[PDB]
Design a protein around this ligand. Structure first.
Ligand SMILES: N[C@@H](Cc1c[nH]c2ccccc12)C(=O)O
Ligand SMILES: N[C@@H](Cc1c[nH]c2ccccc12)C(=O)O
Lengths: 165, 165
């Protein structure tokens, strides 16, 4: 009763959820949500990680850009909420450096699954296995409407993996 | 069948709605939503306008800060939406300079009503007359859930006007 893509999508969902403590920290520290210099660095490092792990870097780049976009979308929604209702901004978020550490371990989890399941990601049955995984994770993580939209954005390029050679 | 605060709240609502073309323009031009230097200038000019029009500048400052916060909240929500779904970002928004001109005429409308209705704003019956106005405007302008929350934020300090002297 389980999708081969469950572990990948669970990681990706877990990494989206880090958006909440990140947004809370940045609100309190007056940091921007999007720093395009930083994102560029993050993607370039992921590309390098992909090559060293024998994964198509162009795939990783696109996929992680979807994931980062999704993450920003959540952060923006939180900022909207806290502008309307500043008393609801969490007053003691976890350290940004702890959130980044969580992110970096999740990046690795996702890369390791992308490599392992490359035949699935690149096969015609991917779209179905991904829908199944998404539904399962939305339920297991109790993802609300916002996180649901985000998870769809973050996974929208998964099934465009191409077979090698 | 009409609140004395209807004209003020209608102006304020109209000015919130300018958030949409502003957010669409800034998305396309890669401009930030919040520039705190700019906001500070905007508030300082409003304070000066208030003095010249014999309105309590401290009131105007707080009220317009609520209105600007509300406006940002809408812009942030749009940015969240367009991160998830970039195809829905309006591709040909009106000129930012036209939006600013609309804003400046609405500022004046709001200031003129604040002066005219100062006895009401500062009286115990304000809270009731404001609730009535809000409900009427939400209906007449067909304001959705987001704009409803925003209009509440933008008007939250209206009834704290104090009688002179
Ligand atoms: N779009 C801006 C929004 C923002 C959030 N926090 C900020 C702090 C400073 C300047 C801008 C911001 C950004 O991504 O940065
Ligand atoms: N919080 C940021 C968000 C933002 C929107 N557009 C931007 C463009 C550049 C930098 C930041 C932004 C701000 O208010 O600016």
């Amino acid at each position: 009763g389980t999708s081969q893509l469950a572990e990948l999508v669970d990681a990706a969902a877990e990494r989206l959820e880090v958006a909440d403590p990140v947004a809370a920290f940045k609100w309190r520290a007056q940091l921007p949500i999007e720093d395009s210099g930083r994102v560029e660095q993050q993607l370039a490092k992921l590309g390098e990680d992909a090559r060293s792990q024998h994964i198509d870097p162009d795939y990783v780049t696109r996929v992680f850009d979807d994931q980062i976009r999704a993450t920003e979308a959540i952060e923006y929604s939180r900022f909207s909420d806290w502008k309307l209702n500043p008393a609801s901004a969490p007053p003691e978020p976890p350290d940004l450096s702890a959130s980044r550490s969580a992110i970096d371990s999740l990046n690795n989890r996702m890369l390791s699954q992308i490599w392992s399941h490359w035949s699935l990601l690149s096969a015609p049955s991917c779209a179905a296995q991904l829908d199944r995984a998404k539904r399962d994770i939305v339920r297991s993580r109790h993802l609300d409407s916002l996180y649901q939209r985000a998870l769809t954005t973050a996974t929208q390029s998964y099934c465009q993996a191409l077979p090698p050679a």
